[PDB]
Design a protein around this motif. Structure first.
Motif, PDB file in Angstrom:
ATOM      1  N   UNK A  78     -39.416 103.847   7.723  1.00  0.00           N
ATOM      2  CA  UNK A  78     -38.017 104.035   7.362  1.00  0.00           C
ATOM      3  C   UNK A  78     -37.875 105.011   6.188  1.00  0.00           C
ATOM      4  N   UNK A  79     -38.832 104.943   5.268  1.00  0.00           N
ATOM      5  CA  UNK A  79     -38.829 105.821   4.090  1.00  0.00           C
ATOM      6  C   UNK A  79     -39.048 107.271   4.506  1.00  0.00           C
ATOM      7  N   UNK A  80     -39.944 107.501   5.464  1.00  0.00           N
ATOM      8  CA  UNK A  80     -40.180 108.883   5.968  1.00  0.00           C
ATOM      9  C   UNK A  80     -38.950 109.364   6.765  1.00  0.00           C
ATOM     10  N   UNK A  81     -38.266 108.454   7.456  1.00  0.00           N
ATOM     11  CA  UNK A  81     -37.034 108.840   8.166  1.00  0.00           C
ATOM     12  C   UNK A  81     -35.918 109.264   7.192  1.00  0.00           C
ATOM     13  N   UNK A  82     -35.822 108.545   6.077  1.00  0.00           N
ATOM     14  CA  UNK A  82     -34.843 108.848   5.030  1.00  0.00           C
ATOM     15  C   UNK A  82     -35.133 110.217   4.398  1.00  0.00           C
ATOM     16  N   UNK A  83     -36.417 110.521   4.207  1.00  0.00           N
ATOM     17  CA  UNK A  83     -36.801 111.806   3.637  1.00  0.00           C
ATOM     18  C   UNK A  83     -36.595 112.943   4.630  1.00  0.00           C
ATOM     19  N   UNK A  84     -36.804 112.638   5.912  1.00  0.00           N
ATOM     20  CA  UNK A  84     -36.472 113.602   6.974  1.00  0.00           C
ATOM     21  C   UNK A  84     -34.983 113.909   6.982  1.00  0.00           C
ATOM     22  N   UNK A  85     -34.144 112.877   6.942  1.00  0.00           N
ATOM     23  CA  UNK A  85     -32.679 113.094   6.927  1.00  0.00           C
ATOM     24  C   UNK A  85     -32.238 114.007   5.779  1.00  0.00           C
ATOM     25  N   UNK A  86     -32.852 113.829   4.609  1.00  0.00           N
ATOM     26  CA  UNK A  86     -32.588 114.666   3.455  1.00  0.00           C
ATOM     27  C   UNK A  86     -32.914 116.152   3.700  1.00  0.00           C
ATOM     28  N   UNK A  87     -34.046 116.427   4.343  1.00  0.00           N
ATOM     29  CA  UNK A  87     -34.419 117.827   4.625  1.00  0.00           C
ATOM     30  C   UNK A  87     -33.528 118.426   5.713  1.00  0.00           C
ATOM     31  N   UNK A  88     -33.105 117.605   6.669  1.00  0.00           N
ATOM     32  CA  UNK A  88     -32.026 118.018   7.590  1.00  0.00           C
ATOM     33  C   UNK A  88     -30.703 118.396   6.903  1.00  0.00           C
TER      34      UNK A  88
ATOM     35  N   UNK B 225     -30.767 101.179   9.987  1.00  0.00           N
ATOM     36  CA  UNK B 225     -29.773 101.825   9.118  1.00  0.00           C
ATOM     37  C   UNK B 225     -30.208 103.218   8.715  1.00  0.00           C
ATOM     38  N   UNK B 226     -31.513 103.427   8.535  1.00  0.00           N
ATOM     39  CA  UNK B 226     -32.033 104.770   8.224  1.00  0.00           C
ATOM     40  C   UNK B 226     -31.941 105.688   9.455  1.00  0.00           C
ATOM     41  N   UNK B 227     -32.095 105.100  10.643  1.00  0.00           N
ATOM     42  CA  UNK B 227     -31.967 105.853  11.896  1.00  0.00           C
ATOM     43  C   UNK B 227     -30.493 106.230  12.129  1.00  0.00           C
ATOM     44  N   UNK B 228     -29.589 105.342  11.721  1.00  0.00           N
ATOM     45  CA  UNK B 228     -28.135 105.617  11.772  1.00  0.00           C
ATOM     46  C   UNK B 228     -27.724 106.728  10.809  1.00  0.00           C
TER      47      UNK B 228
END
Lengths: 30, 30, 30, 30, 30, 29
Positions: free
Chosen positions: B7-17, C8-11
């Protein structure tokens, strides 16, 4: 073990997501 | 654990997006 | 717990992807 | 439960990725 | 079991994410 | 059950990511 294998694949997925995020940053900053 | 790390890597991915989106905006306004 | 937090991170990721898509359409427009 | 909820958020992410893929295709199509 | 099948689909997702990261790098390099 | 249902949605996501990679390749090429 199936559950043991699940733990390994989630960790490997995280690693590929990290490397994706790096390529996105490099594209953004290029 | 493993799921939290993912989940933490997904959050960091969203930030770079998000930051890629800004560079695309800025290019368009150029 | 952690499964909900991951959802929630995927959302949130899906939100940033939608916003990227919007900027790409705006670039395409002009 | 939370696993079904995760599955649903994953489906919604996939839908956003499909929409992003289209905006990229539309940008490519001169 | 269903867990083994989940682990396999996660592995296959990681593989696609790796391939997307390469395409993004090739785009960058252009 | 819900685990299989999750595995399905992950398969379907992998498919949309492969399609995205193709559009990106086409845009580069």
């Amino acid at each position: 073990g199936e559950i043991k294998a699940l733990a390994q694949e989630i960790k490997a997925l995280a690693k590929e997501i990290k490397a994706l995020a790096f390529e996105i940053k490099a594209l953004a900053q290029g």
